[PDB]
Amino acid sequence: MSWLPPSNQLSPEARSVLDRMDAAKAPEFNGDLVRQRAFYQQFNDDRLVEMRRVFRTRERHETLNAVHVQVVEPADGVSARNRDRVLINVHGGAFMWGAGSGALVEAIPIAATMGVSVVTVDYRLAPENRYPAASEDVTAVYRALLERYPAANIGIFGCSAGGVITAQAVTWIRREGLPRPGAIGTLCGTGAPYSGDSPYLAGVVPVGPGVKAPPLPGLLPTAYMEGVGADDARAYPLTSDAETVFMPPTLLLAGGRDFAVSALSLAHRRLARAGVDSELHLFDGLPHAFFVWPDMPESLEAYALIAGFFDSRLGLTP
Amino acid sequence: MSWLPPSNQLSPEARSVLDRMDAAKAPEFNGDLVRQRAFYQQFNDDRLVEMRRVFRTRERHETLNAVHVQVVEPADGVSARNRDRVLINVHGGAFMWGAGSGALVEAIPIAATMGVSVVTVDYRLAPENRYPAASEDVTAVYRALLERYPAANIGIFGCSAGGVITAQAVTWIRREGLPRPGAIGTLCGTGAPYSGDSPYLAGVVPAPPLPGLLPTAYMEGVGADDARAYPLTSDAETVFMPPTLLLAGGRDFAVSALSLAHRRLARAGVDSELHLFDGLPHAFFVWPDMPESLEAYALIAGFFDSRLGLTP
Ligand SMILES: [Cl-]
Ligand SMILES: [Mg+2]
Ligand SMILES: [Mg+2]
């Protein structure tokens, strides 16, 4: 928030990115979905230009069990170590955009940094489609990849809305009776509402002098989730002791100034108490989804933590 | 943070503790160290009463290599799980107080929750003593414990100033040529200055830049370059750290330093774990009357239970 100086931990590069992130903030769209989607198409294309400058990858289109995916590989080839591994990426974009370039923006840095194949899923978006459409889509992709890869060697990750869907996909996979994935990354978001202090600090809910700050909702406000109960453990698994016990090893990663931080710190407590192997990282001073901007050492550092989590937690053998 | 509601994650018991914490806040002492020490003696005696009502432990005084300790155990004895393990506690208290009751306030909940022997160190305090006096004292106790316990089965933990001294003791043990401890807990502080956003949000600053050193008399005249004094800022010292638990309240001025320490340990390939308790301040877990404190004690116990060895 505005009274503070930039975190004194940030690289000069990051301080530059923060100025541009603030300057690049969306105008009010007033329900004009077409104008909103155009804005974020340009945003995602802009970050993809930055990704392609830093990383060397090759992308193919594929269809797996009637779901459209992009398969992103390092241009140098997958490492020997990762021959029998694969990651599924679930893009962010507020459950309403991010298809195509936003999906590549999340898949490219991980494919290149880990030296692994990343299958980024073109799941059904809101407002046209509702929960559990995205869960069904990611589970269909997962089901296809089990023909080629052991469950223990498959990771699933996503940023923001993609972190929410990654957690929801886990429960849908269990509902289908499939073996659970080897590990997941619930980045800047998980299967829980936003809670705690961080939504107030990040300015998602206004606070200050003369302001009667309201309580926070116990549901994600997106149309994708409208009408889904708090008590649906498959929709909100990190609030459910039962679905939390069944989670695979989980990475939770956020910027320090991300409205998601308080929810992820509580989710990590719950996973620890449930006996699940989880890891939490916070990058002080950085906002929600900071690692879609690759021109700072902090983003490369995040890609290394994501790669290192999967490299440690996923199985290797065919 | 006056414009914020209490974190909606907190138990009703925690919301009560928040009000008790505010009632218990120190007045301005204007550098009168005697009045300050008297206030914190009373503070620590008050938390000790709370600890004694919640947990059943026995405390013994011992001397190990000329350093005074209290040995804190569950009243009916250490668990079979922990027969070949011991923790060293290093108390907080701004490097100037916390001796005796402060030390028991950190040792009792962990001894009782884990079912383990906790040896809490009566280290030399500022301003009478300066760095590296406390590192020397903790290392002397560690040296004595190696007579009975494998290095891999010894943990060291402390809160606030004690978390700082824990990290500094690690480097001192290495300087002495001893085997490194099995695991440490750098709770609400580590071998690094307070940095990042959290000191501003916690309101321990009104904005100006932050210091690159710890401002305490204990550290006066120690350089930033002393990697033994500030190991979590040194790439070299960080690689040699043992498995580390970092834990703080979400509103603690230590949060940002610990998140960076955790990133540094991960990059260095050290096993580390971070937990943050949304809505709680610095050293929250000296107040045992809330589920969140019991939960913190269980994370501390779980970390040492997973990372310490079991061989005799
Ligand atoms: Cl962690
Ligand atoms: Mg663990
Ligand atoms: Mg690790």
Side-chain angles (χ1 to χ4, degrees), chain A residues 72-82 84-206:
Chain A
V72 175
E73 284 179 9
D76 293 337
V78 307
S79 75
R81 188 159 163 97
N82 295 326
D84 294 299
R85 282 166 169 182
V86 62
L87 306 178
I88 303 173
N89 171 247
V90 189
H91 69 85
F95 304 92
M96 296 189 297
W97 52 79
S101 54
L104 294 179
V105 163
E106 289 178 43
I108 282 167
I110 310 310
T113 299
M114 187 174 179
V116 71
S117 185
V118 180
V119 175
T120 189
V121 180
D122 187 27
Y123 57 86
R124 275 174 290 166
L125 299 169
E128 303 85 355
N129 303 273
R130 290 160 74 51
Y131 176 83
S135 293
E136 287 178 332
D137 286 350
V138 168
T139 299
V141 168
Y142 182 76
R143 183 195 312 114
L145 293 170
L146 291 173
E147 297 155 348
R148 292 178 300 128
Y149 302 88
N153 303 9
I154 301 175
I156 313 181
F157 73 101
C159 176
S160 181
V164 177
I165 297 162
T166 288
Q168 287 175 341
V170 170
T171 69
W172 202 261
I173 289 162
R174 190 174 84 88
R175 174 180 178 279
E176 180 167 331
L178 290 173
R180 84 168 182 207
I184 69 182
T186 61
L187 318 177
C188 305
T190 189
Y194 77 50
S195 63
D197 287 346
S198 64
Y200 294 110
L201 298 172
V204 170
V205 181

Side-chain angles (χ1 to χ4, degrees), chain A residues 276-278, chain B residues 273 307:
Chain A
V276 175
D277 178 8
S278 66
Chain B
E273 178 165 350
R307 276 57 177 194

Side-chain angles (χ1 to χ4, degrees), chain A residues 208-211 213-268:
Chain A
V211 192
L216 295 173
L219 297 182
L220 289 168
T222 169
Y224 183 72
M225 296 303 298
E226 182 276 349
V228 176
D231 55 349
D232 183 341
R234 298 188 173 122
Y236 293 104
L238 275 291
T239 72
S240 167
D241 298 356
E243 290 293 350
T244 295
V245 156
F246 289 122
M247 286 281 154
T250 299
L251 176 65
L252 304 96
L253 192 146
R257 298 190 180 190
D258 185 341
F259 48 83
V261 163
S262 302
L264 296 181
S265 66
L266 179 62
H268 178 52

